[PDB]
Amino acid sequence: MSSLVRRIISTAKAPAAIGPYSQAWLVDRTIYISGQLGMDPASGQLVPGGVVEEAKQALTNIGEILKAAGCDFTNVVKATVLLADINDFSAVNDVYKQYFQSSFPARAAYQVAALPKGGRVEIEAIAVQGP
Amino acid sequence: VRRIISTAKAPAAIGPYSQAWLVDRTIYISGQLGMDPASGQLVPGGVVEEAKQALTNIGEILKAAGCDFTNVVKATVLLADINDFSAVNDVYKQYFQSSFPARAAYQVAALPKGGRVEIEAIAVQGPL
Amino acid sequence: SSLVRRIISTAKAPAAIGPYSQAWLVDRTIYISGQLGMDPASGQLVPGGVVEEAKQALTNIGEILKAAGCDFTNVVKATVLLADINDFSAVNDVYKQYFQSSFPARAAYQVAALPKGGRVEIEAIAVQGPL
Numbered sequence: 122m123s124s125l126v127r128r129i130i131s132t133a134k135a136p137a138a139i140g141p142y143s144q145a146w147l148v149d150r151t152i153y154i155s156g157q158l159g160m161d162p163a164s165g166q167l168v169p170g171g172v173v174e175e176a177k178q179a180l181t182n183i184g185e186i187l188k189a190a191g192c193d194f195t196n197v198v199k200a201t202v203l204l205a206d207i208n209d210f211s212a213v214n215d216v217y218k219q220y221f222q223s224s225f226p227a228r229a230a231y232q233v234a235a236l237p238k239g240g241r242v243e244i245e246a247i248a249v250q251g252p
Numbered sequence: 253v254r255r256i257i258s259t260a261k262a263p264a265a266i267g268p269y270s271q272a273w274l275v276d277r278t279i280y281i282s283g284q285l286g287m288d289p290a291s292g293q294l295v296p297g298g299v300v301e302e303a304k305q306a307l308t309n310i311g312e313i314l315k316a317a318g319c320d321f322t323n324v325v326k327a328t329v330l331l332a333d334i335n336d337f338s339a340v341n342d343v344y345k346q347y348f349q350s351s352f353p354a355r356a357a358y359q360v361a362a363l364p365k366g367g368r369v370e371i372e373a374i375a376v377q378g379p380l
Numbered sequence: 381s382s383l384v385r386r387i388i389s390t391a392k393a394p395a396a397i398g399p400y401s402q403a404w405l406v407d408r409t410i411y412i413s414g415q416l417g418m419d420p421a422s423g424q425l426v427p428g429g430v431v432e433e434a435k436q437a438l439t440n441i442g443e444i445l446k447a448a449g450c451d452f453t454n455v456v457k458a459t460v461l462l463a464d465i466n467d468f469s470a471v472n473d474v475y476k477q478y479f480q481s482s483f484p485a486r487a488a489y490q491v492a493a494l495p496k497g498g499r500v501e502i503e504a505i506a507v508q509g510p511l
Contacts (some may be wrong), residue, residue, distance in 0.1 A: 124379040125277065129351070140337075141345050142355035149277070150374050150383065150407075153326045156356035172289050199411040200334045200405045203358055207493040214398050221399060224387065228400035229414035230505050231461055232493040235334040235359040250407050252382040254507075256482060267472045268479060269486035273456040275507045276408075280457040283487035331487060360491040362465040372487050 124152050134185040139238065144150065145186050146238040147250070152190050156203070157182045158238060170243040172209045176216040179244050184220070186250055196248040199227045203243040205235040207232040213242060253277070263292050266364065272313050275378075279317050283330070283372040284309045285365065294339050299336050299368035303343045306371050311347070319375055321347055327373040328352045334359040340369060383407045383496065392443040394418040403444050405508075410421050414461070414503040415440045429468050430499035432473045435510060437502050444479070450506050452478055457502040460488040471500060 138144065138155070144156045159175025161168050168178050187193055202213065203220075206208040211229070225249070226246075234241050257272040258264075258280070272281045286295050286302025295305045305320055314320055317336070329340065337357070353373075363370050388403035396402065396413075417433025418427050423464075426436045426488045438481070445451055460471065468488070484504070492499050495501075 122379055125376065138352075140341055140355075140357070141348065141352045143352050144354075146354050148325055153374075154352040154483055155354040156358075195503060197408045198406055201356075207495065210398075217399055225396075225399045227402075227404050227411045227413040228398070229459075229501070229502065230398070231414075232490045233358045234361050234492050235356060237337055238332065243356070243358065248409070249383070249385070266382050267468075267486075267488075268476050269483045273484070275456055278486045282485040283489075319433070330487075335506070360489045361492050364468060364488060370487070370489065 130189050132185055132189040134162060134189070135182045136162050136165065145190060147190055152192065152248040152250065154183065154186055154246045156243045158236070158240045158243055161202045167238065167240060172205075173212055173216060175240060176213050176242050179242060180216065180220045183244065183246060189247075190250075192248055192250060194250065195224070197221065198224045198245040198247050198249055200244060202228065202230040203233045203236065203241065204230065204238060205233065205241045209241070218242060257313060258293070259312055259316050260293070262289050265296060272317065274317055277377045278333055279314075279315065279319070279375040279377070281310060281369045281373045282314055285339050285363070285367040286365050287368050294365060298341060299333070302367065303340060303369050304339050306345070306369060310371065310373060314375060316379070317375075323378060324348070324353050325373040325376055327371060329355065329357040330370045331357065331359045332363055332368045385496055388444060388447050390443065390447040390453065391445060391476055392420060392447070393440045394420045394423055397423070403448060405448055408505040408508045409440055410445075410508070411449065412441065412504045412506070414501045416496075416498040416501050425496065425498060430463075431474060433498050434471050437500060438474070438478045441502065442502060445506060448506070449482070452486060454509060455484045455504050457485045458502060460486065461494065461497045461501040462488065462490045463494055465490040467499070470495070482484040
């Protein structure tokens with residue numbers, strides 16, 4: 122008796138879902154984004170190079186999903202960084218660094234036991250639509 | 253639209269938390285293990301059987317808030333062994349038939365009571 | 381259409397050891413960053429172990445809530461991250477001293493490692509009162 126707008130997000134500029142989930146959902150004004158690994162949308166595999174290159178690809182994947190929802194990085198209000206080794210903390214912050222330039226979102230970060238597909242880093246996020 | 257959601261004749265005291273909270277139109281649900289509503293103990297059979305009970309418990313909480321599985325928008329799957337990824341996904345699909353929600357999944361070091369799987373979720377009420 | 385959005389930043393909580401803000405208020409919901417048992421003035425962990433670190437982490441969460449016009453009764457969800465699952469009972473006893481009644485929804489588990497070698501970290505979400 123008071124309907125809410127719900128819309129699915131799906132773009133090829135981002136990797137396909139290796140499991141039973143959707144890329145993102147928009148409900149009312151909030152966007153829930155699934156966890157992203159450092160996978161290349163063209164090859165379907167993790168990029169080589171290690172944790173730094175995987176973190177750059179994962180954040181680029183998040184950017185294409187945000188644009189497909191009519192947003193950019195200034196719309197993110199919270200994020201979670203999952204690491205395979207707590208000793209990569211300083212290096213990952215240096216890549217995370219450049220995408221959220223200032224006015225950083227809320228965040229949480231810790232080392233996990235293992236990630237799917239043997240990845241070294243995984244990142245999820247929540248955003249709110251303009252204005 | 254701000255109240256604690258509780259199921260009738262059920263246990264929920266493995267510590268200081270509530271089953272779920274409804275605020276405005278969003279429902280925040282606590283992480284669920286494969287525990288028996290009648291026995292208070294983990295069900296036998298392993299990780300595959302524990303996942304079936306954990307999702308059934310989530311279903312009973314949704315019903316107490318006037319919703320079903322089509323109202324879930326996000327979920328997180330916590331595993332004790334990453335080797336169980338494929339098996340848990342096959343059970344997960346049987347509850348969400350199509351139009352899957354957003355999700356995240358990874359392996360943790362350990363779960364309470366020695367459980368093998370735990371699932372939390374968020375839902376939004378509908379005008380249905 | 382346009383919604384309210386602003387940042388939270390007060391010196392009664394520790395400064396951010398990385399690219400994140402203490403909390404975000406959007407519409408009526410508050411997203412709070414994960415807190416360790418750090419002393420707000422020195423940025424060092426308080427002495428005593430996991431029991432003392434849990435008390436300080438919850439005190440930090442309280443000061444951020446007040447800077448957003450809330451208290452502990454406004455929290456609807458929280459996550460408890462432990463370095464050792466055998467600390468479950470002791471941390472639960474500290475938890476009850478801050479969330480006394482009508483408990484929020486929760487999740488708890490043991491992670492592989494936390495930043496700065498902490499023994500416990502807690503995040504939460506809150507919603508403002510009607511008043």
